Amino acid sequence: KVFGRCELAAAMKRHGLDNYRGYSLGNWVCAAKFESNFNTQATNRNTDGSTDYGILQINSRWWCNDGRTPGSRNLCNIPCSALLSSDITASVNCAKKIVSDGNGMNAWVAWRNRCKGTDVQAWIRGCRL
Ligand SMILES: [Cl-]
Ligand SMILES: [Cl-]
Numbered sequence: 620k621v622f623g624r625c626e627l628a629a630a631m632k633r634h635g636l637d638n639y640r641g642y643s644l645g646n647w648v649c650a651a652k653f654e655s656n657f658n659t660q661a662t663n664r665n666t667d668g669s670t671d672y673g674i675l676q677i678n679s680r681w682w683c684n685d686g687r688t689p690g691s692r693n694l695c696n697i698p699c700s701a702l703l704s705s706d707i708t709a710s711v712n713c714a715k716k717i718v719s720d721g722n723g724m725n726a727w728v729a730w731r732n733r734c735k736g737t738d739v740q741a742w743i744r745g746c747r748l
């Protein structure tokens with residue numbers, strides 16, 4: 620599923636990511652935009668053999684199990700396939716644990732390089748929320 624901008628903002632608010640650990644909804648939409656282009660089925664392979672999955676592009680090195688990342692962990696305790704669902708609850712609950720792990724949203728390189736320090740509010744401007 621490829622979400623629209625206001626459509627995703629709304630789902631993320633329902634699941635509780637608005638202001639979670641201090642990050643407003645605009646940071647999360649902005650991050651999804653550049654991580655996946657709002658496509659829940661996005662996948663990308665990392666040089667070390669790990670793979671990033673779903674709308675927030677969560678990494679198998681640490682957070683989910685795909686059976687093909689030697690030595691990795693599965694801290695969210697889910698198959699990476701569940702991060703590809705048209706329902707975003709698995710991606711949202713794993714993101715919650717990730718952003719609380721010490722470094723905040725700096726765990727998403729793209730948030731760091733393309734959203735951090737920008738008018739993120741413009742990503743929810745206009746939306747019936
Ligand atoms: Cl915002
Ligand atoms: Cl980047």
